[PDB]
Each structure stands twice: as C-alpha cells, then as structure tokens.
From a paper:
The human [name] ligase ortholog [name], also referred to as [name] or FAAP, is part of an essential heteropentameric [name] ligase complex ([name]-LC), along with the DEAD-box helicase DDX1, as well as FAM98B, CGI-99 (also known as RTRAF or hCLE), and ASHWIN (ASW). The [name] ligase complex is an essential factor for both [name] biogenesis and XBP1 mRNA splicing during the unfolded protein response in human cells. By contrast, the [name] ligases are GTP-dependent enzymes that catalyze the direct joining of RNA strands with terminal 2′,3′>P and 5′-OH. [name] is the only subunit of [name]-LC that is essential and sufficient for RNA ligation, but it requires the protein cofactor Archease for multiple-turnover catalysis.
To address this, we determined, at a resolution of 2.3 Å, the crystal structure of human [name] in complex with a [name] molecule and two divalent cobalt ions bound in the active site. The structure of [name]-bound [name] likely mimics an on-pathway, product-bound state. The [name] guanosine base makes hydrogen bonding interactions with the sidechains of Glu230RTCB, Ser409RTCB, and Lys504RTCB. The ribose 2′ and 3′ OH groups are hydrogen-bonded with backbone nitrogens of Ala430RTCB and Gly431RTCB, while the phosphate oxygen atoms interact with the sidechains of Asn226RTCB and His428RTCB. The phosphate moiety is further coordinated by the Co2+(A) ion. The two Co2+ ions, referred to as Co2+(A) and Co2+(B), adopt tetrahedral and octahedral coordination geometries, respectively. Co2+(A) is coordinated by His259RTCB, His353RTCB, Cys122RTCB, and the phosphate moiety of [name], whereas Co2+(B) is coordinated by Asp119RTCB, Cys122RTCB, His227RTCB, and three water molecules. Unlike the prokaryotic [name] orthologs, human [name] is active in the presence of Co2+ ions, suggesting that the Co2+-bound [name] structure represents an on-pathway state and not a catalytically inhibited complex.
Author numbering: 3 to 55, 60 to 434, 444 to 505
C-alpha cells in the first residue's frame, strides 16, 4: 500500500475528530476514531507516511487493530495524546460487551505498569511561602521519597502486608494510619478493587513487588510541587479546595512497580495458550487476549485488580511521605497545611462499567491504556463532592511546562464512555535540560541526572493542545492549569 492509499480510509468527521473506516486493517468489527487538533494532526499522518517509506506499528494502525478485537462495541478510540505502545496504543480506549461470549480481555490494553496514575494534593500554601525554601523543599521530598531504579521502601513491609495491600488497597493504608479517611473518598474506586485476588499474583511478582511498595520508580514517575496558574472553572476549583492563583499543589505519578509488570508479563505468556485453544485471531501478537469468562481472562482480571490495589497503596505511601516532608520544612502538621487529596485517577486499567451503547445500557469491560476515566456529573459512583462538577481528571504535562485538572462531562460519557487523555504523550544534552529548568526557576532532585534528556519537555507533545482538543470536543472540560516549581525524578 502506498501512503496515498492509506488516506482512502481516513476521513475527518468534525473540527477535532478523524474516522478510521473499516478495511484500514483486516477484520475491523467497528470503526476507529482519533481526536486531534490541526497541530496534533500533522504528526499522526507523518508517522503513517514514514511507515509506507521499531517494535510497534503506527498509532493509527494500532487503533484499527484493536477495532478488530472480538466483542468490542462502539469504536476503538485514540485520544489526542496517543502514541504507539504494546498492542494497544498508549492513549487508546476499547470497551467490550461482557454479555458477548466472544468478548476478550487484553493485557496489552491495560499496560505493563498496571494502575500507573496520578494523585493531586492541595495545600493552603502560596508560591511566595515556597519560593524562599524551594531548594530545601525539593531536597526534603527527595530524602523522604525513595526514588530511582533500586530504591527500597521506607515504610517497612513484609509479605503479610503486601498480601493485605493486594486485597485491600487504600484500606490497608487507612487502617495502618498512612492514609487519611478523605483520601479514600477522593480516589477512583475508593482505592479498592473488590475483585482483586492475591492468589492470582505470582510468587515472582510478589518477590519483586515487596521491596518496591512505597517507592516512586523512574522515567515518567515524579513527585511535583506546583502552583495554580489559572482557574478555568471557578466552581469546580472551589469544590477541589482551590480558590486562587498562587495556591500550591503536589502531583504524584506512579504505578504498580515490579509487581504489576510481572502480572502483566505473566498474563501475556499465559494468553498464548488461551488463544489457540479458544480460536482467537488477532492482527498483532501484541494484542494477545483471552475470553473474559475463560480461566485465563478471569485470572488476569483478578491479578490486575490486585496490582491496581498495590498501586493505590504505593501512591498512598508517597503521599504520607510527602506530607511528612512538607511538615518538616514548614514546621507544622500536614493538617494545618491543608494537605488533602483532591483526587486519584488511574490511566492504566480495565474497569467493569455500565454504559449506554446501541440504545441499551450494557455492562462493559472498558480498557483504558494511557487514558483516563472521566465520569460525568451526577454519576452515582463518584464522591459527593464531585457530584455537580463531574469527576476530576489529573493530566500531567512535563516537568518544564504545565499540568491541568479537567472534569468529566455527559458528552464524554456518551462519546467515549467517559474517557479522556492522560498526558501530553510522547511525540514522534542532559545538562542543557537541567540548565533550562534552572533558568525557569524550577528546582529538581533527580536520582539519575545523566538520563534527563529522555524526560525533556521536547520529547512530549504540547499538553495544552491535548487538553484543548479534548475540551473543544467536549469529552472533558478544563478546570485548572498548574505550573511546576520543583520536581523529584528517578
Ligand atoms: N507533570 C509532569 N508530567 C510528566 C512528567 N513526565 C511525564 N509526564 C507526563 O505524564 C504522562 C504519563 O506518562 P505515562 O503514564 O504515559 O508513561 C505522560 O504522557 C507525560 O505527559 C513530569 O516530569 N511532570
Ligand atoms: Co508508569
Ligand atoms: Co503513568
């Protein structure tokens, strides 16, 4: 196929959405769509054009291949931050009818870092309160939070605790005093997936997992101190405790570390057998999957949920440590600093959700790999404080640019099953990067300084284009813009 031929199946629906017609890839059950603005459009097509003239297929082709998966409903959707990934693209949403016996679960549609995600903390501090002790604060966050490839947990944990954490999620953290009661209330799934079964997490996963529980990791993972730069939705900001520009917040991004990676890996191995036996055909081996009802599909879903709970405990630990560091620098209690959790969302998980599709409300398995749930106003499952706003959505940009808080919308619930973006996304000298941060007034403590070129803001897309695409499309609504002033990296 020539590049021009590829264009035959690509048709622009509206200002910010493209349609991927059936036939782009073989056996598509539904169409594919990708939401982008004029600036994001160029890169999608340039990547497709370069393929006509890595270990992953072009993002566009990955969206179509997921569209060929059995049991899918509605459309295979690529968000504006979409980039190529393992099987599913990072920034993709695919939902499956759980009453269809052909419907599958795909670990590639969740991701190796199971329940990678973001927690947003607010404070009653102002940028003028932090600027004088900025270096001291960053140092304190670094000393307190294990960060880096081989860092061990600070909060001591043994196998029993891990086992309880796999089953209980934030509830273990609450029970032992590391989490506040309100943290659980403002957390997606209330920090606890009930379907988790620690027996479906392997021994190797647990061995890897135990010393990393209570650690940040590396690469994209961060603890970032931010200032509210703009407020787009005053009402929503007020419900999140944010009332003025200058307010200081903390954003934490982490997942399930080695435990989750192993669980994902074990599932992929196990799924090869399931596919042959159950006659499952895929366009791409990275889309290896299992029938939801099969033992392979069920074992993975339960182990995924357990890894999910792990990640919530991990972000809870990070929060406790963060509160501790802030407390020390400012010689006050975390409560007097108003260091409450605004929200905690995943952007790597499969969820069982009720959704109207093809006229009837149905029970779907919603795969969100590199995308974020964004439930609308009046959804029964979200907390009382966000009933009128809709669900907060935490979008980290980069360490040198900006981040956003968005809210879920009814239109998002309709068009994308309440799914929006998760970040800027990857786009298609290390001392320079550090120097630039310093120029900008951004403090930083990094476990591995020579590797910061990889995490430079130039390697990601423009996050403001990504959120504005989702905003104009209507699937999530801008609420708050944040600016980093200090960041911890691995
Ligand atoms: N705020 C902030 N966001 C980041 C940083 N590094 C990566 N991100 C964002 O976090 C998102 C999550 O990454 P992912 O989970 O896809 O690997 C990325 O798409 C990227 O935009 C950082 O240092 N600070
Ligand atoms: Co991650
Ligand atoms: Co992430």
């Amino acid at each position: 196929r020539s590049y021009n031929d590829e264009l035959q199946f690509l048709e622009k629906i509206n200002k910010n959405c493209w349609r991927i017609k059936k036939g782009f890839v073989p056996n598509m059950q539904v169409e594919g769509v990708f939401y982008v603005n004029d600036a994001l459009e160029k890169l999608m097509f340039e990547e497709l054009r370069n393929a006509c003239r890595g270990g992953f297929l072009p993002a566009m082709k990955q969206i179509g291949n997921v569209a060929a998966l059995p049991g899918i409903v509605h459309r295979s959707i690529g968000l504006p931050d979409v980039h190529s990934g393992y099987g599913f693209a990072i920034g993709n949403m695919a939902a499956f009818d759980m009453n269809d016996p052909e419907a599958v679960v795909s670990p590639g549609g969740v991701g190796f870092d199971i329940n990678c995600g973001v927690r947003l903390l607010r404070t009653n501090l102002d940028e003028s309160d932090v600027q004088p002790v900025k270096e001291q604060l960053a140092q304190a966050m670094f000393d307190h939070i294990p960060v880096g490839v081989g860092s061990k947990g600070v909060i001591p944990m043994n196998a029993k605790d891990l086992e309880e954490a796999l089953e209980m999620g934030v509830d273990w953290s609450l029970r032992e005093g590391y989490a506040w009661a309100e943290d659980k209330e403002h957390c997606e799934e209330y920090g606890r997936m009930l379907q988790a079964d620690p027996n479906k997490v392997s021994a190797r996963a647990k061995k890897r997992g135990l010393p990393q529980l209570g650690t940040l990791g590396a690469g994209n993972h961060y603890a970032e101190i931010q200032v509210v730069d703009e407020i787009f939705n005053e009402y929503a900001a007020k419900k999140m405790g944010i009332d003025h520009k200058g307010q200081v917040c903390v954003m934490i991004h982490s997942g399930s570390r080695g435990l989750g990676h192993q669980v994902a890996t074990d599932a992929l191995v196990a799924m090869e057998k399931a596919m042959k036996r159950d006659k499952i055909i895929v366009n791409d081996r990275q889309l290896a999957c299992a029938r939801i009802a099969s033992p392979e599909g069920q074992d993975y879903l339960k182990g995924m949920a357990a890894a999910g709970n792990y990640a919530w405990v991990n972000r809870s630990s990070m929060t406790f440590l963060t509160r501790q560091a802030f407390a020390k620098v400012f010689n006050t209690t975390p409560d007097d600093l108003d260091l409450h959790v605004i929200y905690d969302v995943s952007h790597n998980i499969a969820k069982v959700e009720q959704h109207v599709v093809d006229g009837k409300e149905r029970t779907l398995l919603v795969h969100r790999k590199g995308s974020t749930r964004a439930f609308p106003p009046h959804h029964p499952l979200i907390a009382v404080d966000y009933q009128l706003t809709g669900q907060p959505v935490l979008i980290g940009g980069t360490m040198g640019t900006c981040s956003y808080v968005l809210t879920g919308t009814e239109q998002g619930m309709t068009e994308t099953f309440g799914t929006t973006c998760h970040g800027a996304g990857r786009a298609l000298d290390f001392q320079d990067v550090l120097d630039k941060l310093a120029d900008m007034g951004i403090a930083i403590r990094v476990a591995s300084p020579k590797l910061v070129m990889e995490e430079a803001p130039e390697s990601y897309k423009n996050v403001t284009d990504v959120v504005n695409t989702c905003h104009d499309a209507g699937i999530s609504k801008k609420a708050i813009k944040l600016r980093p002033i200090a960041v911890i990296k691995g």
